[PDB]
Amino acid sequence: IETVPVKLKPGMDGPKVKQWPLTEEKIKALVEICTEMEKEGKISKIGPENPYNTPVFAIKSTKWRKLVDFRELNKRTQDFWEVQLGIPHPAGLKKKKSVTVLDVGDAYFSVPLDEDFRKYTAFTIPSINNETPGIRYQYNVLPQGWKGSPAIFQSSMTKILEPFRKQNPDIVIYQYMDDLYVGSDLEIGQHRTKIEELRQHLLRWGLWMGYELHPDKWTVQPIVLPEKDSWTVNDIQKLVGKLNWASQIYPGIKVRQLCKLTKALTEVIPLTEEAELELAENREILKEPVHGVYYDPSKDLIAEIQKQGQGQWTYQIYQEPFKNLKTGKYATNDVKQLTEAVQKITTESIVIWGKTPKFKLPIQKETWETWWTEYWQATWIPEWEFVNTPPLVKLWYQ
Amino acid sequence: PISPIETVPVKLKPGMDGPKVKQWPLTEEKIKALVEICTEMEKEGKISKIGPENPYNTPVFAIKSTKWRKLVDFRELNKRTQDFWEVQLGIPHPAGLKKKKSVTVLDVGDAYFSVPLDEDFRKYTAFTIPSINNETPGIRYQYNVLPQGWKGSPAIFQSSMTKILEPFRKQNPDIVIYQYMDDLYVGSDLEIGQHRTKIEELRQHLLRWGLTTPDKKHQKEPPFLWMGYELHPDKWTVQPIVLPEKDSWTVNDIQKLVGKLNWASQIYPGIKVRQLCKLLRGTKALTEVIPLTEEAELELAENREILKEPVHGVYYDPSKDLIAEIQKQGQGQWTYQIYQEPFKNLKTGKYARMRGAHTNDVKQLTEAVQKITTESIVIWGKTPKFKLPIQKETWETWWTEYWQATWIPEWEFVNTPPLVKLWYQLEKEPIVGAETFYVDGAANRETKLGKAGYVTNRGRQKVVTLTDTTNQKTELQAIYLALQDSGLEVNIVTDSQYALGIIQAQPDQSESELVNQIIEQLIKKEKVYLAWVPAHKGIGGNEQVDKLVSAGIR
Numbered sequence: 043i044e045t046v047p048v049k050l051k052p053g054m055d056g057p058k059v060k061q062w063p064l065t066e067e068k069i070k071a072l073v074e075i076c077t078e079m080e081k082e083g084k085i086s087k088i089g090p091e092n093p094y095n096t097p098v099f100a101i102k103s104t105k106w107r108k109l110v111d112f113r114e115l116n117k118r119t120q121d122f123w124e125v126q127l128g129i130p131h132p133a134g135l136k137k138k139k140s141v142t143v144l145d146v147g148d149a150y151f152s153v154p155l156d157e158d159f160r161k162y163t164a165f166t167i168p169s170i171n172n173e174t175p176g177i178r179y180q181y182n183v184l185p186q187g188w189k190g191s192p193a194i195f196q197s198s199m200t201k202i203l204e205p206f207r208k209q210n211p212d213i214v215i216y217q218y219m220d221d222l223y224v225g226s227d228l229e230i231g232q233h234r235t236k237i238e239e240l241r242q243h244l245l246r247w248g249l250w251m252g253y254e255l256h257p258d259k260w261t262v263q264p265i266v267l268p269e270k271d272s273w274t275v276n277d278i279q280k281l282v283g284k285l286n287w288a289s290q291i292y293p294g295i296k297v298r299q300l301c302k303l304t305k306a307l308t309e310v311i312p313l314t315e316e317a318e319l320e321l322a323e324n325r326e327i328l329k330e331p332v333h334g335v336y337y338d339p340s341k342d343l344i345a346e347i348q349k350q351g352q353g354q355w356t357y358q359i360y361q362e363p364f365k366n367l368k369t370g371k372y373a374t375n376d377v378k379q380l381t382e383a384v385q386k387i388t389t390e391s392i393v394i395w396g397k398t399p400k401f402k403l404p405i406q407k408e409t410w411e412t413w414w415t416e417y418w419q420a421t422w423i424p425e426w427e428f429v430n431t432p433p434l435v436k437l438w439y440q
Numbered sequence: 441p442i443s444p445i446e447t448v449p450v451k452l453k454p455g456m457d458g459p460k461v462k463q464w465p466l467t468e469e470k471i472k473a474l475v476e477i478c479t480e481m482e483k484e485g486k487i488s489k490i491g492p493e494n495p496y497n498t499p500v501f502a503i504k505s506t507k508w509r510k511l512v513d514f515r516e517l518n519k520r521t522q523d524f525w526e527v528q529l530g531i532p533h534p535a536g537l538k539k540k541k542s543v544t545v546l547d548v549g550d551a552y553f554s555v556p557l558d559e560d561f562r563k564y565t566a567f568t569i570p571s572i573n574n575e576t577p578g579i580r581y582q583y584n585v586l587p588q589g590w591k592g593s594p595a596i597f598q599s600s601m602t603k604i605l606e607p608f609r610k611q612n613p614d615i616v617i618y619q620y621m622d623d624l625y626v627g628s629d630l631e632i633g634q635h636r637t638k639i640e641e642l643r644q645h646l647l648r649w650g651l652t653t654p655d656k657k658h659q660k661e662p663p664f665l666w667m668g669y670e671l672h673p674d675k676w677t678v679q680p681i682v683l684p685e686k687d688s689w690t691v692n693d694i695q696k697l698v699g700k701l702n703w704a705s706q707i708y709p710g711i712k713v714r715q716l717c718k719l720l721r722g723t724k725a726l727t728e729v730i731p732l733t734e735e736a737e738l739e740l741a742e743n744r745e746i747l748k749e750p751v752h753g754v755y756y757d758p759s760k761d762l763i764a765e766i767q768k769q770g771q772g773q774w775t776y777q778i779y780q781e782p783f784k785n786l787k788t789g790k791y792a793r794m795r796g797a798h799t800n801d802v803k804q805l806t807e808a809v810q811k812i813t814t815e816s817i818v819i820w821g822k823t824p825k826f827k828l829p830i831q832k833e834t835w836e837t838w839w840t841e842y843w844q845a846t847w848i849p850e851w852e853f854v855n856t857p858p859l860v861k862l863w864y865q866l867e868k869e870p871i872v873g874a875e876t877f878y879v880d881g882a883a884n885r886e887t888k889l890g891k892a893g894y895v896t897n898r899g900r901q902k903v904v905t906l907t908d909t910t911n912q913k914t915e916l917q918a919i920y921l922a923l924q925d926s927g928l929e930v931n932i933v934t935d936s937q938y939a940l941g942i943i944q945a946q947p948d949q950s951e952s953e954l955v956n957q958i959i960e961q962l963i964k965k966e967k968v969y970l971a972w973v974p975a976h977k978g979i980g981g982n983e984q985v986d987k988l989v990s991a992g993i994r
């Protein structure tokens with residue numbers, strides 16, 4: 043086994059990312075993990091000649107797991123993992139009755155990493171109250187979290203999967219970062235049996251959400267128009283505004299007749315013939331997907347989240363603003379619920395397009411940066427920005 | 441000596457070659473001094489004579505006082521040399537330090553000159569001592585050790601020091617060593633005799649690695665002054681703060697005052713710097729005298745009272761819990777204390793930050809909690825239990841209804857007035873028996889003239905003219921009008937999301953005069969219901985205001 047040469051491009055320097063302060067228990071957990079990885083020769087202590095840095099976190103059941111934030115490196119290594127060695131996405135995955143996610147990141151530890159690239163995988167275990175310099179390391183093997191790891195390994199993954207794929211032609215396997223996405227139209231019992239069969243194939247070779255995923259059942263959350271016995275001026279105004287913003291997305295939406303009826307908000311106005319028809323006609327448009335919107339593989343996916351109150355969260359995935367590719371919902375505390383939603387939306391985004399979306403988070407940067415790791419369970423991290431949710435967009439999406 | 445430790449491999453920046461900077465002809469005194477200084481360094485193995493083949497050069501200078509010092513200008517080589525990892529991420533806070541029975545301060549002798557340089561890099565440190573009037577070839581020398589003023593020296597010295605200390609640290613886990621530049625701070629719980637022996641063991645381990653230290657008769661004693669603090673055996677404080685008595689304060693004097701107060705605020709509770717910082721606004725000459733406002737004079741007097749008596753801080757005990765308390769000490773001003781045992785503070789602090797344009801006390805307190813949370817994780821690696829001047833019901837009513845996700849760790853209400861409260865609450869549904877004001881505002885983008893007005897279900901109409909205003913301003917002046925000309929209960933319809941968004945967030949403080957005028961009106965009212973409609977959609981009421989508001993080109 044020999045190394046695959048990795049390149050960033052003629053330009054573009056490596057990552058120089060700050061390490062967010064970690065808790066005592068998280069630091070200790072990392073030193074235990076890293077001492078074992080050093081001994082096993084997976085990572086090596088580094089000198090100051092390596093100016094690079096990638097953040098590290100410790101996540102969970104009871105056992106601690108090391109999570110490296112390779113977002114900057116993945117961004118800076120795009121030519122390698124995407125254009126040069128791209129893993130193709132199957133359109134069939136989203137159509138399967140049941141999809142199973144299995145962690146395969148332990149396979150990357152058996153493969154060495156290009157000596158000339160190693161320096162870019164530099165990370166720091168910080169010390170409490172800056173009392174000690176801070177433990178510096180770099181990877182010797184393909185690191186979990188880096189998008190270059192499955193790009194290099196794909197050739198070895200194909201050999202492992204070759205018999206299982208031949209014996210099961212209707213089963214679809216997709217490799218995304220440290221996970222395998224296994225889809226089938228089989229009955230749940232048979233599906234689970236085939237998952238255990240695949241685990242054994244991986245055992246030789248050395249290897250929110252729920253038990254499985256059901257993407258064939260993934261329906262969009264339609265923009266809901268209230269069904270009222272009595273309608274006040276205010277009710278119409280809310281309905282006029284909601285439909286007006288929906289007309290920007292859905293081709294065919296009409297407000298004209300509803301607009302036709304200086305009055306007090308509390309005053310009741312009777313529901314006219316053509317407006318009742320318009321409302322029923324718009325209702326039918328919102329049920330079906332948006333006409334004219336298609337996924338551009340060269341464009342970045344963007345996701346917006348709205349806190350709906352009472353443990354309810356709404357979300358939309360788009361490339362061009364308000365042109366929705368998917369809309370949906372998620373059902374103890376605000377941050378815990380939000381991290382659960384982010385992970386769920388990312389899991390769907392991977393299944394459907396083979397890419398993660400950039401999140402527009404309705405939270406203060408600092409609050410999120412402090413707490414996200416406390417509830418996070420995924421091997422990956424999506425891109426995120428901190429946004430102030432416009433008050434209207436929450437109301438328009440229920 | 442020169443440490444036997446393996447060299448750190450150095451490289452130049454990718455597309456760069458070593459410096460080839462011409463040596464300027466120097467004075468005879470300077471040439472004499474440099475030769476003298478260089479001969480002693482060469483004899484110690486710090487530098488080595490080189491041939492004419494080496495093409496790299498860095499300029500040298502000599503400055504005098506009776507002693508002469510060698511000054512190498514590494515500006516060019518530093519530009520060409522690679523980047524290095526940051527020496528240290530931060531400085532320890534005294535509040536985070538655990539009690540240690542005995543303390544010794546050791547200083548490394550000729551630190552950089554005691555650490556070897558990468559053999560492959562040595563050539564780049566080449567310098568020439570010019571001959572009298574540069575007539576004959578000069579004396580060519582290269583560094584074998586870390587040169588003073590070179591980019592890689594601070595990083596390479598610390599890593600070497602960290603590598604050297606590693607075996608000692610492992611062999612002595614109960615001993616504490618703090619590395620900072622040429623200094624070494626050793627602490628232990630061992631009794632005076634046992635400690636002094638372990639110090640010597642360390643000095644001997646350091647000598648075994650080419651590093652000299654001062655002997656037991658040269659070390660520091662009484663109350664340890666470290667990094668701007670006074671470290672006593674069982675307590676800590678900041679170094680003495682002299683608040684100068686001045687009849688006239690220059691920009692520079694105020695700048696220094698604020699820094700000294702901000703430094704004092706780590707242990708002195710209630711320190712305020714707001715009114716003094718207001719005097720720093722305006723960008724004036726540093727020597728310029730600024731007349732103190734009554735508010736600043738009052739603030740300076742309140743600070744002088746806090747600093748009249750010395751206040752101390754306690755050290756960290758990992759067995760006990762961390763408790764953080766916050767108090768509102770004016771508008772936008774927040775004060776905090778962190779302790780383990782009631783009122784025996786580990787540290788103190790303040791928060792005053794206008795995140796965005798408009799805010800309320802509930803948002804400000806949450807932001808203050810967040811600032812302390814991060815701070816606590818840095819200093820102690822854990823979050824404290826908070827004691828807040830807000831009712832659990834005020835917090836619950838706020839967070840559940842607010843669009844933003846807000847989560848604060850384990851906390852309890854403490855009745856320390858002023859209390860955090862919501863000054864007004866907007867209605868969930870429209871009000872019956874209340875006048876509905878349809879408002880609108882439109883300003884001419886060229887003439888800057890604006891028109892704010894309203895139309896009501898009760899028949900009332902009013903239009904006012906505004907000078908040098910934006911559309912953002914007119915839509916805001918329109919809501920202010922509706923609040924000014926209305927009674928205790930009101931319904932307000934706007935086509936501005938900007939105005940809606942601000943008002944919906946329940947602000948009680950703002951940068952804008954208009955917003956604070958609106959706030960003042962919102963508190964007075966008994967009931968207010970704010971609604972939004974899309975502009976230019978032919979909506980009854982909205983279309984009526986638009987007509988009388990757009991009149992005069994808009």
Ligand SMILES: Cc1cc(C#N)cc(C)c1Oc1ccnc(NC2CCN(Cc3ccc(S(C)(=O)=O)cc3)CC2)n1
Pocket residue numbers: 173532537538539540541542543544545616617618625626627661662663664665666671672673674755
């Ligand atoms: C950052 C730092 C600065 C100085 C200095 N400078 C000394 C040391 C070892 C130091 O590093 C650390 C690391 C962990 N815990 C502590 N614990 C400290 C808690 C405060 N004591 C204060 C103290 C003062 C005098 C004596 S004496 C005069 O009794 O030996 C004992 C303790 C020093 C260790 N200090």
